[PDB]
Design a binder for this molecule. Sequence first.
Ligand code: NAD
Ligand code: NAD
Ligand code: NAD
Lengths: 470, 470, 467, 474
Amino acid sequence: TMIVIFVHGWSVTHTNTYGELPQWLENQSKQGKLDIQVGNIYLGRYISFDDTVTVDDIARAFDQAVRDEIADKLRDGQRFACITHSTGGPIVRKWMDLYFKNNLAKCPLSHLIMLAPANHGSALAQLGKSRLGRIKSFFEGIEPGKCVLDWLELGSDMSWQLNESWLDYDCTANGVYSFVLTGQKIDRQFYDAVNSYTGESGSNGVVRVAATNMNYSLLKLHQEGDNGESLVVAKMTRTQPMAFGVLPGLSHSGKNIGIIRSITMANAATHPTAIWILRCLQVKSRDSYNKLVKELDNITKETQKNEHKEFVKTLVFTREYITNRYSMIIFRLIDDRGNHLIDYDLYLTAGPQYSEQALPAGFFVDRQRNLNNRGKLTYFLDYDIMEGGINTPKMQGNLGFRVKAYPESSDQALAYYRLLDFHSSKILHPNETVMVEIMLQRRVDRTVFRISNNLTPAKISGKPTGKKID
Amino acid sequence: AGTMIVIFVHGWSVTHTNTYGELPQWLENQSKQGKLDIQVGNIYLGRYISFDDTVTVDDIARAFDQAVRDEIADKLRDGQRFACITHSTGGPIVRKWMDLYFKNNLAKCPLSHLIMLAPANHGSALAQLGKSRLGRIKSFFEGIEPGKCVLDWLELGSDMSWQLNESWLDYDCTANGVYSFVLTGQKIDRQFYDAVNSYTGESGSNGVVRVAATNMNYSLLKLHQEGESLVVAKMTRTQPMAFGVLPGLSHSGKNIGIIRSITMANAATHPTAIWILRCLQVKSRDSYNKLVKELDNITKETQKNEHKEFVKTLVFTREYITNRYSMIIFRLIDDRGNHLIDYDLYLTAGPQYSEQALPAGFFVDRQRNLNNRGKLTYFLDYDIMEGGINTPKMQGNLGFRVKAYPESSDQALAYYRLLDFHSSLKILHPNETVMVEIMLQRRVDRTVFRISNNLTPAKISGKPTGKKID
Amino acid sequence: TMIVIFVHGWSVTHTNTYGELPQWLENQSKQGKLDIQVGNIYLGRYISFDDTVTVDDIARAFDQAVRDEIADKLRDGQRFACITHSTGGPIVRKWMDLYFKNNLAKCPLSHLIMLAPANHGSALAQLGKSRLGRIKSFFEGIEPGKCVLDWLELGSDMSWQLNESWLDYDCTANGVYSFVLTGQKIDRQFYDAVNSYTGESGSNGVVRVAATNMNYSLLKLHQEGGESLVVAKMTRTQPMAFGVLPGLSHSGKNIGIIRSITMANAATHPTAIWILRCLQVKSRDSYNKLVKELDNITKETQKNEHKEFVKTLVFTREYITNRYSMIIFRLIDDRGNHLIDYDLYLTAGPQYSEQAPAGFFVDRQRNLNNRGKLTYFLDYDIMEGGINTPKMQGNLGFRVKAYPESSDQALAYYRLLDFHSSKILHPNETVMVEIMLQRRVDRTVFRISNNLTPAKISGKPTGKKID
Amino acid sequence: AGTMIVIFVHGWSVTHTNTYGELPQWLENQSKQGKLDIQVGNIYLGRYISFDDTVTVDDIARAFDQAVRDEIADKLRDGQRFACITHSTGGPIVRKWMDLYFKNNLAKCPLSHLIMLAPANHGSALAQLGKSRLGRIKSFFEGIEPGKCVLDWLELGSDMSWQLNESWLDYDCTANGVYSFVLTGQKIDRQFYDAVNSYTGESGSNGVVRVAATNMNYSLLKLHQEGDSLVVAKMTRTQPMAFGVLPGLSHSGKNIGIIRSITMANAATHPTAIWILRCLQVKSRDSYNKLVKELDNITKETQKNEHKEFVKTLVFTREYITNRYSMIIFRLIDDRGNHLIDYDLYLTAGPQYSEQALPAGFFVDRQRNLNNRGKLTYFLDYDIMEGGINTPKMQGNLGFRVKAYPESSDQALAYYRLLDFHSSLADIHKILHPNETVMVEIMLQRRVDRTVFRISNNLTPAKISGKPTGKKID
Ligand SMILES: NC(=O)c1ccc[n+]([C@@H]2O[C@H](COP(=O)([O-])OP(=O)(O)OC[C@H]3O[C@@H](n4cnc5c(N)ncnc54)[C@H](O)[C@@H]3O)[C@@H](O)[C@H]2O)c1
Ligand SMILES: NC(=O)c1ccc[n+]([C@@H]2O[C@H](COP(=O)([O-])OP(=O)(O)OC[C@H]3O[C@@H](n4cnc5c(N)ncnc54)[C@H](O)[C@@H]3O)[C@@H](O)[C@H]2O)c1
Ligand SMILES: NC(=O)c1ccc[n+]([C@@H]2O[C@H](COP(=O)([O-])OP(=O)(O)OC[C@H]3O[C@@H](n4cnc5c(N)ncnc54)[C@H](O)[C@@H]3O)[C@@H](O)[C@H]2O)c1
């Protein structure tokens, strides 16, 4: 009654990317642990190395591939589970959005198990097609498709569109049980030295675990107050809870410790991914699901506690690597007129007074700005260093945002924005991404247009009246 | 329930209200003699900022609303309505202001008349030349360089002018007690022909804006591909509006500026002053109809007399041929929502429409928009087109052929197929622009995603099936 | 006692680009009309469709291929003749410049016959790699190397550099006999409706007649000086054989200048005819008589091809092809900078009015990598006809103004230059026009004062200039 | 029969001559007390335009010569020479001036002393930050946005910076009676730190210029790829110049600006006033060489006292570590004249020269020039590196590895070969010196395969194969 479909990631050119997990599940079903008839396990192959192919298209082609091989079985009423890796995750989420956003109860997918999904993007996607194809994790010279890489770029418009659309989902309430499994171990033998993201703390060498999590909040900040005063009003929303687990000592790819690539028949019984793939596949109820959620999070705590400090030693060097728990902000800033702000300055603030110079030492990990939509900003931060120094008596747990959009207020300004200030701290969570959309009031001065019945001609002064228009 | 207000609106790079010539002084006196009902002090000079890089057209239209309320909110509340006499970009400004504030209830927009002097309603070919290069041109000597965002508005094939004009397809000013008129000229002030820029003397233009781009009588043909490839044509058209081409008038200049060259002494004989007075005297649909025919007659008289111009000097003899012209603005997208940038576009003619059968001399110019490279503005010679195509061996045919890439090939995976629209005398009209939005069928090959239950790992072939997906 | 090597053009993937001319030169030699041993005819094949391969690469490679195959025969005192087509011409010209610039008496090349070389560039190159590859004749969809396009875009730095070096050449005096043979016929099937250059008058569909000629002048105008102003300096290459053959396009089996040559039509093919004559030249006299005969063929061809009437059951059209002139402008200043923002004017008439003949202009192009290189394409006949009249006194000049202009605030600017002359233009010829502007800096850019009381720094110009 | 003349020239962003603090009046009164021989009226305040986009550094140098000739022509004719005291970009400008008029006859240059305070001789990391972002920085609150041509010059690894400073390799200021000096500081004025641009508080700088960029004791390093892969290296170095890292001084600001904070009430105890007065008194090869010995001593003590700073407010406690750093400026060309832009560069250390063996914390910052993509400037911590490399297990080794593209592959036709260079932190002939910039020019051997051109006398037409021969052409 159960069908299983594997979906790989980008820059994949061989179906052994799935390791030996497919054979395992078929072999496990033969022993009564799964109800998968012979021939109901499918290996998915899709073309991710084409510059002309967008993400939507592959989601359209996935639909065509599903109806093609198993329309008869879906008519009988079987439903399938999705075990994806890397881009496969976002692809299937798009396919669901393209075909079942508002009738998920009638979607033929029964389970969706995502392995290290770049649900909120990969920092390396901005590196390009050629500079990143050189990294042996892809290899060829110029590997993955440009349009796939536009999607995965941090602060991507399409990424925001699909994830804000997914804010409304309720998979559990509709009989769809989704999960996310990821690791935070760097396969240090493949660290590209002149591309630090490959050994970034908080990642498996490719995707940051905070980008894997499907538990995230959208925070909308609207500027108000006429010419003073009131200013910012906040409204926050959150996805439905999803089973989230950071498993121990598993990187993104590679036979050695690849989250899926490292699965063999011999080690499947003790492979964290193999073990938990199955337990998720076994879910058939709401209580079973929620018991798996509270089990997975417990593991997440354990692995991130056990992988906090690492001492690797060669005959040449001695090194300690610190891996904490992290967070991610995707900032979008628009205005009340439809323009997308691209020129601005954004500050995190803290202290009794919400000063931009007060955040604890070491709060920052990385700042990236999207190439196509420049006005999108993705910050990568150390939640543990922050929360540690944030939550004290004389800092009071404060954290805020200050956007200085441009052009700024001046004695000659005619269309400009004002300083926006927000004071809070719950915005950030460990191993979580946050989407902050900040809407500013575009302020046009009355001088931009004036009328006077003084019919004696005169020069048109660019003299601002210092008074805004309604 | 009685009285008339008049508000003048100038054009771009205007820094002095003498841009309006002496037309305000004239109308005040004409109303004093009983030819209009305009109380003393109800004629207004508008002055807005067009030389600011930060100020948008939306900004100015919004600022116009505040300027109106700021000065004549009381009178409007008394049941008074104003007539906007606009010049150049002032027209696009006022149209945008009706769209922002009163589209779906024009019946009580405070505007009763809109007389539009030489407005780049469908853009100005000069805009793409740039800010610095244009400020140095003889058409811009009288002011400062133009705003970057204003220039983004008047660029041929611009998105904003497209958005505004498609919205104006649904307008109906006449039925709502709003009488709009467009008046322009087609004479080149040859003393201001920029040498290294032919647009400043382009036939069918007044040195700045093309006659066809001033007309508000335009169509929108949406051509959708279906499929053996098929095409479905659907066209709509604006409501009839008064349109006049007056004799021997340029865009600006004290010599023959359509409004700039109006003095107290020459107003009685000035074509602009005469017909502006007539237009303001309309208070009925029948009066509107009568003016429509009378104005069209002036267009045919004007374009008959100005067909040839003989310039002789002690140094050279020259003949200038100004005919009647047509304009297209092509938009090209696909059925998945993407906006296409790479395509080849053909006009067709003959028995079954060869791209090489067009009459010699059909072409005047084409321009590709800088921000949307998929927007194509063609400028053609309707006389020569119609003259050759409406013959027995030509059978009065015309069509479009679009070749968008990636094209069909063994490289397929993702591509488009040719479109052939087969039509016409109608698509073209003299002194008229037409918007041709063509929706393509994006085809995806099935190997873009396939699933197979053969658990034996294998390489992933990028070879298309030759069969598209749904 | 002679070797022949064929060199092809860009986007060529098959040796048949040379038509059947190679077998024709082997048979003509066997009949006693040339002294070529059997096996001394060579087909050169170089890669032009690789984005990473440069013209410098291909030249360096030509030398290695020559040495790899005929080092034996070259030391035995044989020397070879190169018959080039399209970009193959510039390639040999570059090789020539890499290994035998200072001593053409020791170069193994004895003859160079160039078939429609875009020696001064091709207007098509700017169209891009993708757009050009879609032209059915060369069809593929993205084809030629981008570095090849960089060399062959009008006004490119490299072709400019190679050809400035060529004002110092004199192949004939060094025993080397050079030739340019081209046509001006449009193969009208290959006309691309979205790219009008494909039928441009004054071209063979790809190369303009004035772009293949090696008879050009490099005119240098140095603005000196409140006033005083212009100084002119013109240098010109040594004479070369230039022939415009009848009824031949760039490529295609129908009327390709070399591609349409067959075993059966070679005797009447204008190319095969004059290729044999060019190879038979062996002295100053043979070269000079050949030169003038090509001049007669050029005037005969261009007089018969002035008007062409094409006929179809759907339309009847008339094609007028005149003789055209190309100017290539280079604009720098007395400091080494390359000027990008400026307006350029042709001026004519008694007062040299930039506003003064109708139809003078055909095309203008701005190079994509060097923004300051401006290429004119002009109708010489219409030009000469309108200016060499009583009321226009045959005058022709330039005017340039680089930005910043002299302004109320300008501190680093340029002064208008005005050249008066006319010989700059000749039909079927390109002229390279380098203009050195005088960069003027106002003193306010730097002042010193012993008034030690601090004060704000005003940037208002003093109205004076620094040395 | 003369006295000396002194001319101040400021840096970029300067709209007011108070940028020089009160140093000029101090030098006037100090001369009045017999400590200098400056006649009244022989001290000049220079003002050049740094905020105009149309104005290049070459135009500033040109204008300086005209200004000097406009004001003190007959003074210089009568046998007088002037001392230059510069701050920020004024340093390079004068250096550009000397190069335009006296490159190879410094014995005939009217300048007798050059005292540069915070010259971005090798550029400022802030220059890459466009002239719009940079005018928003609170430091130059009083100043307006730069001219773009000054930025292009100040940008790290700019071609024009490489040219002037490469021409300065053959200078010998001391041997021609010209006494030049570099006196900088490394204090961060923590009050004006722009939190959106961390360079403004970068360790190893004063807020604008890194200590490695000020110094004129630098080396040019050439690595020529040879073989039929072997490397041949040629190192060249400038003549010793006075170098001083003075204590507790930032770039600008009346609080602790190296020159902006100078008043007459604090001049007697201002390190910059003390040492400038000493430089101006140099009148021999002897006094000069012993003045640089003194500056080396102060440079040392300054960086030992400023290694650790602790700022304590009621809200937070912080500790800032500042060590000694070195700047590598990479230029990459090939033997054909082309400029290699696409490549990757690995510093390698330890036995067997592994890229993955560099000492932890070796790196501070990397920047790729905007106008010339082939220029790579690395900013490195010398102490952490020298500490980790000059140990038994590391054998004191440091090398370079550049790959260059296209690389060796089945593509081939025109490609490049791996360059492996080995040497350094030995203290005998090392490549990195503390508080120093090093210039590294990398020439790769462009390799073309024989398939790019073949000839054959088999006259039967055939398809042309782009299949690489795997063998190269000379
Ligand atoms: N590359 C990474 O792994 C990484 C790490 C941290 C942050 N980021 C951030 O991602 C964004 C893009 O990364 P980026 O590397 O292009 O920015 P960058 O500032 O680090 O480098 C800019 C350019 O210089 C190149 N370059 C840097 N070091 C080089 C070296 N040793 N050899 C050859 N080329 C070298 C880079 O490839 C890039 O083209 C930036 O915001 C950056 O701060 C990237
Ligand atoms: N800006 C600095 O102080 C700094 C510090 C260290 C290294 N660098 C290096 O200098 C080079 C260029 O500097 P960069 O800052 O442009 O590179 P970057 O990678 O840090 O940022 C790239 C773009 O994102 C913008 N941006 C980043 N954070 C922002 C924020 N909070 N608010 C508004 N805009 C923000 C930046 O202005 C920039 O346009 C890079 O190689 C970079 O790695 C810069
Ligand atoms: N195998 C791994 O997992 C791993 C992880 C981190 C660092 N390392 C290695 O440890 C050593 C110390 O690095 P770190 O942790 O102090 O800082 P880092 O590795 O985070 O590097 C900091 C910056 O310098 C770049 N860089 C790193 N190594 C380089 C090299 N050999 N050559 C040129 N650029 C390089 C990086 O891309 C980054 O921009 C490096 O050799 C580094 O390659 C290895």
